[PDB]
From Swiss-Prot, chains A, C:
Homodimer. Interacts with CDC42 and RAC1 that have been activated by GTP binding. Interacts with ATN1, ADGRB1, EPS8, SHANK1, SHANK2, SHANK3, WASF1 and WASF2. Interacts with ENAH after recruitment of CDC42. Interacts with TIAM1 and DIAPH1. Interacts (via SH3 domain) with E.coli effector protein EspF(U) (via PXXP motifs). Interacts with E.coli intimin receptor Tir. The IMD domain forms a coiled coil. The isolated domain can induce actin bundling and filopodia formation. In the absence of G-proteins intramolecular interaction between the IMD and the SH3 domain gives rise to an auto-inhibited state of the protein. Interaction of the IMD with RAC1 or CDC42 leads to activation. The SH3 domain interacts with ATN1, ADGRB1, WASF1, WASF2, SHANK1, DIAPH1 and ENAH. Adapter protein that links membrane-bound small G-proteins to cytoplasmic effector proteins. Necessary for CDC42-mediated reorganization of the actin cytoskeleton and for RAC1-mediated membrane ruffling. Involved in the regulation of the actin cytoskeleton by WASF family members and the Arp2/3 complex. Plays a role in neurite growth. Acts syngeristically with ENAH to promote filipodia formation. Plays a role in the reorganization of the actin cytoskeleton in response to bacterial infection. Participates in actin bundling when associated with EPS8, promoting filopodial protrusions. The gene is BAIAP2. This is BAR/IMD domain-containing adapter protein 2. Phosphorylated on tyrosine residues by INSR in response to insulin treatment. It is found in: Cytoplasm; Membrane; Cell projection, Filopodium; Cell projection, Ruffle. Residues 129-144 form a coiled coil. It comes from Homo sapiens. Changing residue 144 to E: Abolishes actin-bundling and filopodia formation. Isoform 1 and isoform 4 are expressed almost exclusively in brain. Isoform 4 is barely detectable in placenta, prostate and testis. A short isoform is ubiquitous, with the highest expression in liver, prostate, testis and placenta.
From Swiss-Prot, chains B, D:
This is Translocated intimin receptor Tir. Signal peptide: none annotated. Multifunctional protein that is required for efficient pedestal formation in host epithelial cells during infection. The extracellular region acts as a receptor for bacterial intimin, allowing the bacterium to attach tightly to the host-cell surface. Simultaneously, the intracellular region initiates a signaling cascade in the host cell, which leads to actin polymerization and formation of actin pedestals at the sites of bacterial adhesion. A motif (Essential for actin pedestal formation) lies at residues 5-7. Belongs to the Tir receptor family. The gene is tir. The chain holds residues 452 to 463 of 558 of the full protein. The lineage of its organism: Bacteria, Pseudomonadati, Pseudomonadota, Gammaproteobacteria, Enterobacterales. It comes from the Bacteria. It comes from Escherichia coli O157:H7 (strain TW14359 / EHEC). Interacts with intimin and host proteins. It is found in: Secreted; Host cell membrane. Phosphorylated by host kinases.
C-alpha cells in the first residue's frame, strides 16, 4: 500500500524534471545567452574607451612638461587590457564550458526522460497485473486455515515472490528518480562553480594590478612643495 | 539499444 | 630674438589645447558614454541570469535530497548581488565623478582658451609695437659713441625698460601656457585615478566573497565515499 | 569681468 504512495511520488519526480526543471533550464540558457551578448557589448565599448584614453596619452607624450602624465595614461590603458583579458577568460568559461554543455544535455534529456518514465510505468503495471492475477487464482482455490493443499502453497510462494519483486521495483524506482533529479542539479552547480573559479581569478588579477599601479598614479599630480 | 542518460556519469 | 621663438611656441600650445586636446577630450567623453550605456546593458542582463538561477534554486529547495543544492544556488545569486552592487558603485564614480565633471570643464574651456590666447596676442603685439617705436625714435636722434645727449639717454632707459617688460611677458606667457596644458592632463589623470580606486574596491570585494563561498560550493557534489 | 579658468584650482 505505502508502495502505491511511493509509486505516485516517483511519477511525480519524472513529471517535475520534464515540466519544471528542463523548461526552467531552457530559460536559464536563454538568459545566459543574453548575458553573454551584453558582456560582448561591454568588452567592445571598453575598447573604444581605452583607445580614446591612449589618444590623450599620445598628446601628453608630445608636450613639454606633461610627458610623464602621458606615461600614466598609457599604463591605465595597459592595466585595463590585462584586466579585460582575464575577463575574456571568464567569458569563455561561460560559453564553451557552461552554455554549450547545458544545451547539449537538455537536448538529449527530453527523449531520455520520456523513455525512462515510460519504461518504469510499463514494468510497474506489468508486475502489478501479474501479482493481482496470482492472488485471484489463489482466492479461487481457497474459496472453493492452517491447512494448505500442494497447489495452494505453490501460489503462496509465487505471490510472495512477485510481491517482493514489485516492492523492490518501486523502492529502487523511487531512489533512481530522486538520483536523476540530484544529478541534474549537481551538474548545474558544477558548471556554475567552474565559471566562479574564473571570476575569482579575474577579480584577483584586477586587485593586484591596481594595487601595484594605483599609488604611482595618485602621485603624478601631487604638490612637490 | 535503450536510451543513454545524458547525466550518466555526473557525480552526486 | 629667442623671444620670438618663445612667442611662437606659446601660440602653438594654445592651438594644441584648442584643436587637439579638447576635441580628443570630446571624443573621450563620447566613448565614456557608450561605455556606460553598454555597462548598463550588462548589469541588466546579469539580473535576468541570476533570477533564472534563483528559479532553479527554488526547484531544488522543494525536492527530496537536493535541498542543499537549492541553498548553494541561492548563495551564488546572493554573492552576485553583492558583487554587482560594488560594481554599480564603480559605475556612478564614472558618471557623476568623471563624465559629468569633464563635460562641465570642456564646455567652459572653449571661450576661456579663445579669450586667453587672444588677450596674450594683443598684449604681446602692443609691447612689441611700443618697443619698436621707442627704438625708431632713438635711431632718428642718433643718426642726425660713448657720448649721449640727455634725451638720447632717456630713450635708452625707456627702451631698456620696455624690452625687459616684453621679455618677461613672453617668458611668463610660455610658462603659463605649459601650465594650462598640464592642468588639463592632471585633471584627466585625477578623474581616472578616482574611478580606479573604485575598480580596486570592486575587484577586492569579488575576490573575498568568492574566497569565502567557493570551497563550500565545490564540496556540495563530492563523493561522500 | 575677465573669463574664469575652468581649471583654475587644479593642482599639478
Amino acid at each position: 500500500s505505502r508502495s502505491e504512495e511511493m509509486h505516485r511520488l516517483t511519477e511525480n519526480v519524472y513529471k517535475t524534471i520534464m515540466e519544471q526543471f528542463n523548461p526552467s533550464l531552457r530559460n536559464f540558457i536563454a538568459m545566459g545567452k543574453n548575458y553573454e551578448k551584453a558582456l560582448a557589448g561591454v568588452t567592445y565599448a571598453a575598447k573604444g574607451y581605452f583607445d580614446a584614453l591612449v589618444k590623450m596619452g599620445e598628446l601628453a607624450s608630445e608636450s613639454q612638461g606633461s610627458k610623464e602624465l602621458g606615461d600614466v595614461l598609457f599604463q591605465m590603458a595597459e592595466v585595463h587590457r590585462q584586466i579585460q583579458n582575464q575577463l575574456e577568460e571568464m567569458l569563455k568559461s561561460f560559453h564553451n564550458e557552461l552554455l554549450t554543455q547545458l544545451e547539449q544535455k537538455v537536448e538529449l534529456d527530453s527523449r531520455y526522460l520520456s523513455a525512462a518514465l515510460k519504461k518504469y510505468q510499463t514494468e510497474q503495471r506489468s508486475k502489478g497485473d501479474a501479482l493481482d492475477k496470482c492472488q485471484a487464482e489463489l482466492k479461487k482455490l481457497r474459496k472453493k486455515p492452517q491447512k494448505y493443499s500442494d497447489k495452494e502453497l505453490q501460489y503462496i510462494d509465487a505471490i510472495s515472490n512477485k510481491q517482493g519483486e514489485l516492492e523492490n521495483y518501486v523502492s529502487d524506482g523511487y531512489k533512481t528518480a530522486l538520483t536523476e533529479e540530484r544529478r541534474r542539479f549537481c551538474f548545474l552547480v558544477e558548471k556554475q562553480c567552474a565559471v566562479a573559479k574564473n571570476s575569482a581569478a579575474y577579480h584577483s588579477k584586477g586587485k593586484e594590478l591596481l594595487a601595484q599601479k594605483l599609488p604611482l598614479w595618485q602621485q603624478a599630480c601631487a604638490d612637490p612643495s | 539499444g535503450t536510451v543513454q542518460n545524458p547525466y550518466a556519469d555526473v557525480k552526486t
